[PDB]
Amino acid sequence: AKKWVTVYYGVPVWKEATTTLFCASDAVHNVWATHACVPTDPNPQEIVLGNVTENFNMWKNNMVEQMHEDIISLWDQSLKPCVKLTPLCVTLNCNNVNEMKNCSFNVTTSIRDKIKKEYALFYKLDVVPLTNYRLINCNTSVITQACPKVSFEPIPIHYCAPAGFAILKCNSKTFNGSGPCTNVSTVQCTHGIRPVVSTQLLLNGSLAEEEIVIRSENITDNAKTIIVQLNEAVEINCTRPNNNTRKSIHIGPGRAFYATGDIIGNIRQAHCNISKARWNETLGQIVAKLEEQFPKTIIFNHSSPEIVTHSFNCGGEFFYCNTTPLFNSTWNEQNITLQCRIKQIINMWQGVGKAMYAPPIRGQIRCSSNITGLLLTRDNGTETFRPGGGNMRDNWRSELYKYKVVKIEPLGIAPTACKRR
Amino acid sequence: AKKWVTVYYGVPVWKEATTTLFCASDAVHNVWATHACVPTDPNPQEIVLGNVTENFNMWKNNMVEQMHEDIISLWDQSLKPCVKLTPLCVTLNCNNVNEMKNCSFNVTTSIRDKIKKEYALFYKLDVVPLTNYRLINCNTSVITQACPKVSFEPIPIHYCAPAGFAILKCNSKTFNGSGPCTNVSTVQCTHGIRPVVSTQLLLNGSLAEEEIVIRSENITDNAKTIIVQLNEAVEINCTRPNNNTRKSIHIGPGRAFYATGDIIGNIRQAHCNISKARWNETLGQIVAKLEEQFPKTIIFNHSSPEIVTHSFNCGGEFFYCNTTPLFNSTWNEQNITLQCRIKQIINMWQGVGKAMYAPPIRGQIRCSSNITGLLLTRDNGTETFRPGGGNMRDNWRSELYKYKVVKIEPLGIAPTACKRR
Amino acid sequence: QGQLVQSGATTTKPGSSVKISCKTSGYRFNFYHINWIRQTAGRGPEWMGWISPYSGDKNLAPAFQDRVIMTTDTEVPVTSFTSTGAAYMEIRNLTSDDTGTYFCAKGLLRDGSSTWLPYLWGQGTLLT
Amino acid sequence: ILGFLGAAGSTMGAASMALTVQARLLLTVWGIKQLQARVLAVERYLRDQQLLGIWGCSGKIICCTNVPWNDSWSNKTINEIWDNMTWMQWEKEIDNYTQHIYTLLEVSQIQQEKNEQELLEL
Amino acid sequence: ILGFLGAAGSTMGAASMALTVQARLLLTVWGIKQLQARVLAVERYLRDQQLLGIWGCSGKIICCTNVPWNDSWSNKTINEIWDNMTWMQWEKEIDNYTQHIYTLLEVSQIQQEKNEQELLEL
Amino acid sequence: ILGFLGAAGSTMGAASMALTVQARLLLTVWGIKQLQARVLAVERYLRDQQLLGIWGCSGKIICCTNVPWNDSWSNKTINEIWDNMTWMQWEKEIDNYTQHIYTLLEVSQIQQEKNEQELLEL
Ligand SMILES: *[C@@H]1O[C@H](CO)[C@@H](O[C@@H]2O[C@H](CO)[C@@H](O[C@@H]3O[C@H](CO[C@H]4O[C@H](CO)[C@@H](O)[C@H](O[C@H]5O[C@H](CO)[C@@H](O)[C@H](O)[C@@H]5O)[C@@H]4O)[C@@H](O)[C@H](O[C@H]4O[C@H](CO)[C@@H](O)[C@H](O)[C@@H]4O)[C@@H]3O)[C@H](O)[C@H]2NC(C)=O)[C@H](O)[C@H]1NC(C)=O
Ligand SMILES: *[C@@H]1O[C@H](CO)[C@@H](O[C@@H]2O[C@H](CO)[C@@H](O[C@@H]3O[C@H](CO[C@H]4O[C@H](CO)[C@@H](O)[C@H](O)[C@@H]4O)[C@@H](O)[C@H](O)[C@@H]3O)[C@H](O)[C@H]2NC(C)=O)[C@H](O)[C@H]1NC(C)=O
Ligand SMILES: *[C@@H]1O[C@H](CO)[C@@H](O[C@@H]2O[C@H](CO)[C@@H](O[C@@H]3O[C@H](CO[C@H]4O[C@H](CO)[C@@H](O)[C@H](O)[C@@H]4O)[C@@H](O)[C@H](O)[C@@H]3O)[C@H](O)[C@H]2NC(C)=O)[C@H](O)[C@H]1NC(C)=O
Ligand SMILES: *[C@@H]1O[C@H](CO)[C@@H](O[C@@H]2O[C@H](CO)[C@@H](O)[C@H](O)[C@H]2NC(C)=O)[C@H](O)[C@H]1NC(C)=O
Ligand SMILES: *[C@@H]1O[C@H](CO)[C@@H](O[C@@H]2O[C@H](CO)[C@@H](O)[C@H](O)[C@H]2NC(C)=O)[C@H](O)[C@H]1NC(C)=O
Ligand SMILES: *[C@@H]1O[C@H](CO)[C@@H](O)[C@H](O)[C@H]1NC(C)=O
Ligand SMILES: *[C@@H]1O[C@H](CO)[C@@H](O)[C@H](O)[C@H]1NC(C)=O
Ligand SMILES: *[C@@H]1O[C@H](CO)[C@@H](O)[C@H](O)[C@H]1NC(C)=O
Ligand SMILES: *[C@@H]1O[C@H](CO)[C@@H](O)[C@H](O)[C@H]1NC(C)=O
Ligand SMILES: *[C@@H]1O[C@H](CO)[C@@H](O)[C@H](O)[C@H]1NC(C)=O
Ligand SMILES: *[C@@H]1O[C@H](CO)[C@@H](O)[C@H](O)[C@H]1NC(C)=O
Ligand SMILES: *[C@@H]1O[C@H](CO)[C@@H](O)[C@H](O)[C@H]1NC(C)=O
Ligand SMILES: *[C@@H]1O[C@H](CO)[C@@H](O)[C@H](O)[C@H]1NC(C)=O
Ligand SMILES: *[C@@H]1O[C@H](CO)[C@@H](O)[C@H](O)[C@H]1NC(C)=O
Ligand SMILES: *[C@@H]1O[C@H](CO)[C@@H](O)[C@H](O)[C@H]1NC(C)=O
Ligand SMILES: *[C@@H]1O[C@H](CO)[C@@H](O)[C@H](O)[C@H]1NC(C)=O
Ligand SMILES: *[C@@H]1O[C@H](CO)[C@@H](O)[C@H](O)[C@H]1NC(C)=O
Ligand SMILES: *[C@@H]1O[C@H](CO)[C@@H](O)[C@H](O)[C@H]1NC(C)=O
Ligand SMILES: *[C@@H]1O[C@H](CO)[C@@H](O)[C@H](O)[C@H]1NC(C)=O
Ligand SMILES: *[C@@H]1O[C@H](CO)[C@@H](O)[C@H](O)[C@H]1NC(C)=O
Ligand SMILES: *[C@@H]1O[C@H](CO)[C@@H](O)[C@H](O)[C@H]1NC(C)=O
Ligand SMILES: *[C@@H]1O[C@H](CO)[C@@H](O)[C@H](O)[C@H]1NC(C)=O
Ligand SMILES: *[C@@H]1O[C@H](CO)[C@@H](O)[C@H](O)[C@H]1NC(C)=O
Ligand SMILES: *[C@@H]1O[C@H](CO)[C@@H](O)[C@H](O)[C@H]1NC(C)=O
Ligand SMILES: *[C@@H]1O[C@H](CO)[C@@H](O)[C@H](O)[C@H]1NC(C)=O
Ligand SMILES: *[C@@H]1O[C@H](CO)[C@@H](O)[C@H](O)[C@H]1NC(C)=O
Ligand SMILES: *[C@@H]1O[C@H](CO)[C@@H](O)[C@H](O)[C@H]1NC(C)=O
Ligand SMILES: *[C@@H]1O[C@H](CO)[C@@H](O)[C@H](O)[C@H]1NC(C)=O
Ligand SMILES: *[C@@H]1O[C@H](CO)[C@@H](O)[C@H](O)[C@H]1NC(C)=O
């Protein structure tokens, strides 16, 4: 027979591409601005691609490089209207308590030529001696007070591909970071992802099915972070027991700096709690697969305060929990408690020259979370793994390993015995 | 025969229109933000329009009125994040050196209630007596320091017409500003245009083919600038030989004003150099065509410090070169050197109320450029031509004379002996 | 739709050579051929040959091939569809047999089968 | 052939051939300006496709219709149009009646599918 | 059937059936990003419709043409293509000549309405 | 006729005539708002053209199909519809089954070009 070209439109064929995704949320206002996202589809159309095998790689995946920049942009966008705490860069006369200092300082008020002497409390990590003190940032950057009405709540964010593009899933319940996934499905949007800012310990993330999996790029390369995913969360319970009070200080027309003053009741210690047994059985499960990739003995030690300690957000205040009572074991009732410090000024992500002041939360703080992951770093005759973190885009990468952006090219030409008149 | 209307789609017919063009660049960051332009097409499809004759006019051409506003917008856009030098508007106690003053002044530091006494150098054009001194702008406008990482480098910018529009070229190698060009070609984008900010002397521009051409609107009208285009560039060499030093002055949290302090080595004079012979043969060529439009004797004199002197940008600092040893001739080895002054504060283009502080460049400065144009202005029995400039949009106009925006209207109806069933 | 003015009435003597002009206006000079026709006292009308102001291409009858010098200038554009050009006419071996009225004629169309057909005539020039 | 708009100064008979060349290339300060021109490009294009649609020419490059050529528009012969005038010369001469013929093509298409609807009733 | 892209790993003969499923779903930091993807979606779509238009396939899902299958593109039989290879396997093998066949479909459409225009002259 | 939407309260038989009138006019705080409405206008329009395309009606204003009228949608006669009810009255009565008939038109078009493809195999 004879053969002519016949054009087909809408054929299942796709290329790997990189495009701008958009958000889809459910639903006062949070920093992630999830009220502004499209109302996420109540019916999430997941279509299973039978017989299909696709080549994934969570480490080249550009969705994490795009989400990470969206988080950084949402951070800067949320601090544009809020009050900038530049008049607080003044000489501080700080006391002690017994740890946060008791600092007093002259400040310009709503009237530009009258001075008041206010007092406030500042944690030692927020101040440095020049005795007289100052805020830690003043020789570095302008600081903006976080608006005391925007919430830091991680909200389930869905990432959707534009019309004419596609995201590909991977239902393989033992999938390691890269390679070919033999259980692929296409999705219009990703699942509910929470933009949890964390360090060393992945919080509130998505668990794994079947057994716990560990991932990496080149695991034999020591300078490559290890992303471990747990199959059963271990309960973590953190709290700041001090009953603090918030004071409004009018330092300008409408500019109201919220400070800390007086601890009602007992002075105590901000800390966390996880089960000694549940972290023992879970560290044992993490030890199991550190054999499937290695031979040797498995040593856990402390890190080599943003990165040295477990740093997250509990009710609004950024803890820095010493995780040495966590990674202190060698594998051939009881609560484990970490001593957490508290900062109010954070350098967010970069170091260009913008910091943020977290306004103090009134009363007592206690939050309960799920540690579902772990970011390790291996360094003789043994192998020691220390809590790493490496970079913040490893957090989103632990949740965007299942996904991958491809573009649809629906035009297809092929020969058949068919000629037009 | 009988005749019915038959519709044709995609017919070569265009109208003159005015639409928003976009940029296309090649490729730290420059003020022109050429990294943000579309990667310019490696294959520039130039299609020759045979038999076509189009009516051009570089003086009604709206691409220069649009580019000129894009330059002004890029200037304001590049100074939004940079530090604003309003605390420098303070009483200055200035010395001399032998010219730039040696000024000292109290300044608020990173701590809001402590004072330091800094010293710095400011050219006499940047200061005015109130002996005590101040910065020249303080009774006029807020000044923003140019970010010491954005470059003032003129980058080849391509202007492209949208889909459905067209730009028309003119390959006539003797084309004067207006009239009908008998060698037309269509282009998707313009050529590589450098947004060189200059005055009196066109720098680094596009030469002419065959002979040098002069242009104007109504050359008999004296109040109309003359744009002369050269066919062979004359080499200009400028330099600031003083070996200056940059000092970082922390005048706020993260706000670091870069000043000038101490001249290492010899104190000397910022100046330029062009060849006396090459400017003699080129002034002679400019004299040749000042006869083809006039009869008389051709006198060159000085202008009638932004406009009086040749003002450009050499390595980052804005010179103001006295061009009197340039235009001093009457036509019926040796270097010509101009005495250039240096400003650090410029009023950019407009005078609404925004000025820019160029941070000092460290070390020695020397740049080599090509003068390819000239902006003259004629004023008894003789005719004298003085260096003009007139307006900044004459600079882009010297490069956007070959181009013209037309819109495509591809629908065409016409009669043929053809009726549908 | 334009004028094709010619030269005057120049009368020389046999053996010499005469130059005849043909200045165009009001139409795109490059889009149409320029024909040369004459009517002598002894015959009737006789087609000599046309020249292409665009292609620079000449085609002339064999009876006038080794005598005629035929050239054109290049149009000076006035508008988008208007121009001003000139076509020139010379002859070699001149006699009193060639005495007659001579004109130039612009072509008829720009495409098809009657492209060069002498449509728009000049004014006439009386030879020797 | 000649490229994009290559036969702009050519006869209407020569330019009418290979019209798919001007049919292909028909479709923050820098960012907003560039997106502004991108949206306008699709609008101007779809207007022409909208017109070709309500004329029965949706998909055609050369499209014959039923509207007879009214000599009030142009009393010129076919030979003195397609073999002489250029496409830019022609539509300046028709410029006035161009809006009149757009209305004629639309009624000849609504009075063609309406006669077609009665045709398929049997 | 199977859904959106449901027959991506299926034979070209099975996937070619019910192609209207991948034809339907083809068409401030959050706001600008979302509007950026909305404009691009209509551009990529209209490019395919622009191509289908200048091929005579404007409105078709399966569209036969006149261009014969040059064996230089692929010397495979119809049976070892439509009953064996998948649509993603096929166009990787044709990837090079894909731009050559786009030019062939366009001239076969401009040399079809031009022969159609002479047909209706009688 | 009557203008844009001029026969909105008229019978379906009168409004069905001259439908090219509602077919023409279908296609910084002020700037972003205006560009927001410009992009949405092309999206809503192309959705209707996308639907008309995968029905074989790409280019049609009145388009007959193969799907028979299921009396479960409406047991009314043609005379008590086109000569009585208005176009806004009708589609409120069909509102439920409207999504069912969109699926029927799409399969009747994919099972028409597929039978057409076998037709041209001979
Ligand atoms: C720009 O605008 C100009 C002016 O309008 C266009 O030039 C004109 O083009 C038309 C058609 O393209 C020409 O009409 C044709 O004329 C030829 C005559 O050519 C023959 O005879 C010549 C002299 O005897 C001879 O030069 C030719 O030989 C070749 O060599 C020359 C070298 O000089 C080369 O330049 C030529 O191109 C030739 O290839 C040739 O032997 C005539 O044969 C044509 O008739 C045929 O074609 C038509 C259809 O086109 C058909 O209907 C006929 O039956 C026959 O089959 C046709 O009449 C005209 O002569 C040109 N010049 C003018 C008008 O002054 C130019 O094309 C435009 N270009 C663009 C890009 O727009
Ligand atoms: C942090 O440091 C702050 C100082 O910079 C502390 O604030 C001070 O706290 C002391 C108590 O520890 C207060 O002293 C008390 O004042 C009250 C008020 O009475 C006064 O007025 C009456 C008039 O009716 C007068 O008669 C009295 O003599 C007092 O002058 C008294 O009732 C108490 O007896 C006691 O004197 C200071 O007033 C208070 N100063 C300010 C400016 O607030 C703060 O407590 C420290 N906080 C922590 C957590 O360490
Ligand atoms: C612009 O004006 C500036 C003043 O506003 C000039 O700065 C001053 O420059 C002079 C020199 O010209 C300096 O004087 C020198 O100081 C050094 C430092 O030694 C001092 O400290 C030791 C302690 O170890 C002490 O024992 C000495 O006595 C000094 O007090 C001496 O080594 C020199 O001998 C000489 O005294 C000034 O210190 C300096 N002042 C400041 C604030 O910088 C500046 O040079 C001028 N620049 C130009 C280009 O004109
Ligand atoms: C992990 O998720 C839990 C549950 O969403 C978070 O606990 C919430 O914390 C906020 C603010 O502290 C309270 O308003 C909610 O009432 C809490 N919910 C529950 C069920 O207790 C917890 O803060 C999250 N952990 C991290 C690190 O983000
Ligand atoms: C004209 O162009 C030359 C060459 O691009 C410019 O010289 C450059 O100047 C920059 C900054 O001073 C240097 O980093 C480059 O290395 C220089 N290039 C060369 C080849 O020397 C010159 O500055 C331009 N003149 C003007 C007025 O813009
Ligand atoms: C406020 O200024 C006065 C000025 O006399 C000073 O005595 C006092 O110590 C200042 N307050 C602080 C907290 O430094
Ligand atoms: C700011 O001061 C701190 C003192 O704790 C010092 O460690 C840091 O290097 C300083 N940074 C700059 C930019 O001066
Ligand atoms: C933590 O895990 C428990 C146990 O499944 C679950 O009930 C709770 O919702 C989880 N919290 C989050 C924030 O995922
Ligand atoms: C994931 O599995 C593939 C094969 O299934 C293997 O090639 C790859 O090395 C694995 N990844 C890691 C990090 O071991
Ligand atoms: C992994 O890293 C080691 C060195 O750390 C190197 O020798 C090896 O080639 C790497 N393997 C891969 C697959 O990158
Ligand atoms: C904290 O202190 C406030 C008064 O400042 C009191 O009303 C509240 O009951 C206290 N809360 C606890 C848990 O002690
Ligand atoms: C954490 O708190 C929850 C609720 O208060 C409790 O059920 C769980 O046992 C606690 N776990 C640990 C390790 O403290
Ligand atoms: C963490 O705690 C251990 C003992 O539990 C202590 O030795 C270590 O110094 C602590 N880490 C830091 C950073 O202080
Ligand atoms: C462990 O912590 C939980 C909550 O954090 C608490 O209820 C429980 O009593 C603690 N157990 C011990 C032994 O401290
Ligand atoms: C700074 O202020 C003091 C105030 O006593 C004054 O004496 C001194 O002259 C000032 N410095 C300058 C440079 O004016
Ligand atoms: C600012 O002061 C200068 C003094 O050199 C004067 O020439 C200028 O007119 C003044 N401008 C205004 C707006 O006061
Ligand atoms: C200046 O002219 C010389 C000579 O042609 C050339 O080599 C150089 O690249 C030119 N510089 C610029 C910036 O155009
Ligand atoms: C340019 O040339 C045209 C004719 O070619 C003439 O009319 C016009 O005056 C010239 N322009 C100038 C500035 O002389
Ligand atoms: C040019 O200007 C002169 C006066 O300067 C005027 O008389 C003449 O009409 C002008 N010509 C044109 C073409 O504008
Ligand atoms: C300029 O001065 C610096 C020291 O400030 C010196 O290192 C450098 O060599 C000097 N350059 C010249 C050209 O003299
Ligand atoms: C300008 O400098 C270049 C390179 O340094 C040199 O070749 C040229 O001769 C100089 N010309 C003049 C006029 O100084
Ligand atoms: C330029 O130089 C000449 C002498 O070379 C001098 O007379 C004139 O004043 C200078 N121009 C200015 C503005 O100072
Ligand atoms: C002219 O200038 C160039 C560079 O500016 C220099 O190399 C040359 O020596 C100078 N010649 C004279 C005579 O000054
Ligand atoms: C031609 O058009 C005129 C109006 O422009 C109309 O009155 C006349 O009836 C028309 N004639 C034909 C034959 O179409
Ligand atoms: C179109 O109308 C205008 C009315 O001003 C008239 O001058 C022009 O001649 C008309 N066009 C034609 C082709 O007749
Ligand atoms: C096939 O294509 C080649 C170029 O790829 C061409 O030279 C040849 O003529 C074509 N043959 C057929 C039969 O189409
Ligand atoms: C396409 O061209 C490339 C050239 O690098 C060649 O390697 C490849 O084999 C070609 N494709 C086919 C299907 O032959
Ligand atoms: C009518 O539609 C119903 C479902 O709504 C279906 O079950 C029935 O078979 C259909 N009948 C006809 C004749 O189309
Ligand atoms: C459509 O469904 C609703 C279900 O609530 C029903 O009330 C309504 O009558 C239905 N429409 C028709 C025309 O029957």
UniProtKB/TrEMBL annotation, chains A, B:
A cellular component annotation (GO) from this entry: host cell endosome membrane
Gene Ontology molecular function: structural molecule activity
Domain Human immunodeficiency virus 1 envelope glycoprotein Gp120 stretches: 3-421
Modification after translation, per record: Highly glycosylated by host. The high number of glycan on the protein is reffered to as 'glycan shield' because it contributes to hide protein sequence from adaptive immune system.
Renumbered residue ranges of the record's region V5: 380-388
Location (main, coarse): host cell
Sugar-modified residues: 51, 106, 139, 176, 183, 218, 237, 243, 273, 277, 280, 301, 322, 328, 332, 335, 370
Source organism superkingdom: Viruses
Disulfide-linked positions: 23-37, 82-147, 89-138, 94-103, 160-189, 170-181, 238-272, 314-367, 321-340
Keyword Transmembrane among UniProt keywords: yes
Entry keyword annotation includes Plastid: no
GO biological process: clathrin-dependent endocytosis of virus by host cell; fusion of virus membrane with host endosome membrane; fusion of virus membrane with host plasma membrane; positive regulation of plasma membrane raft polarization; positive regulation of receptor clustering; symbiont-mediated perturbation of host defense response; viral protein processing; virion attachment to host cell
Keywords recorded for this protein, A-Z: Apoptosis, Clathrin-mediated endocytosis of virus by host, Cleavage on pair of basic residues, Coiled coil, Disulfide bond, Fusion of virus membrane with host endosomal membrane, Fusion of virus membrane with host membrane, Glycoprotein, Host cell membrane, Host endosome, Host membrane, Host-virus interaction, Lipoprotein, Membrane, Palmitate, Signal, Transmembrane, Transmembrane helix, Viral attachment to host cell, Viral envelope protein, Viral immunoevasion, Viral penetration into host cytoplasm, Virion, Virus endocytosis by host, Virus entry into host cell
Function: Transmembrane protein gp41: Acts as a class I viral fusion protein. Under the current model, the protein has at least 3 conformational states: pre-fusion native state, pre-hairpin intermediate state, and post-fusion hairpin state. During fusion of viral and target intracellular membranes, the coiled coil regions (heptad repeats) assume a trimer-of-hairpins structure, positioning the fusion peptide in close proximity to the C-terminal region of the ectodomain. The formation of this structure appears to drive apposition and subsequent fusion of viral and target cell membranes.
Record's miscellaneous remark: HIV-1 lineages are divided in three main groups, M (for Major), O (for Outlier), and N (for New, or Non-M, Non-O). The vast majority of strains found worldwide belong to the group M. Group O seems to be endemic to and largely confined to Cameroon and neighboring countries in West Central Africa, where these viruses represent a small minority of HIV-1 strains. The group N is represented by a limited number of isolates from Cameroonian persons. The group M is further subdivided in 9 clades or subtypes (A to D, F to H, J and K).
Full-protein residues shown: 30 to 508 of 860
TrEMBL record, chains D, E, F:
Region of interest: Immunosuppression: 33-51
Protein name: Transmembrane protein gp41
Gene: env
Region (Fusion peptide): 1-14
Residues represented out of the complete protein: 523 to 667 of 860
Topology term for the membrane: Single-pass type I membrane protein
UniProt feature coiled coil, ranges: 92-122
Domain of life of the source: Viruses
Transmembrane segments: 1-19
Disulfide bonds: 57-63
Glycosylation sites: 70, 75, 84, 96
Location(s), subcellular: Virion membrane; Host cell membrane; Host endosome membrane
